């Protein structure tokens, strides 16, 4: 099957690179587009420069 | 009849028996999972 990209509820568009999946030990290569909600990464999975992790909230919280 | 009075009705200590205090009652707390629906991870050793 196909599988969507992760932003942990932080984007509606994403892109892909094979080498990510290739070098992932054949596991994953999805990556956000407009990786929103003060998040960042291929999974919109970390707070960008200036911010930190609201540890109280889950990995996909809007804040 | 009445344990508050002795064999000859002499006034003696009558006491509620020993019971758990917290049984079937309400408690106000600070917070709880599920609002918003939340996750939680559990590790197990082997």
Swiss-Prot record, chain B:
It comes from Gallus gallus (Chicken). The lineage of its organism: Eukaryota, Metazoa, Chordata, Craniata, Vertebrata. This is Netrin-1. Netrins control guidance of CNS commissural axons and peripheral motor axons. Promotes neurite outgrowth from commissural axons but acts as a chemorepellent for trochlear motor axons. These effects are mediated by distinct receptors. It is found in: Secreted; Cytoplasm.
């Amino acid at each position: 099957e196909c599988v969507a990209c992760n932003c942990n509820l932080h984007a509606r568009r994403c892109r892909f690179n094979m080498e990510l999946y290739k070098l992932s030990g054949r596991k994953s290569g999805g990556v956000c587009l407009n990786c929103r909600h003060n998040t960042a990464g291929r999974h919109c999975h970390y707070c960008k420069e200036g911010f930190y992790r609201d540890l109280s909230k889950p990995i996909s919280h809007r804040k | 009849p009445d344990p508050c009075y002795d064999e000859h009705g002499l006034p003696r200590r009558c006491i509620p028996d020993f019971v758990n205090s917290a049984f079937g009652k309400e408690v106000k707390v600070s917070s709880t999972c599920g609002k918003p629906p939340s996750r939680y991870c559990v590790v197990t050793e082997k």
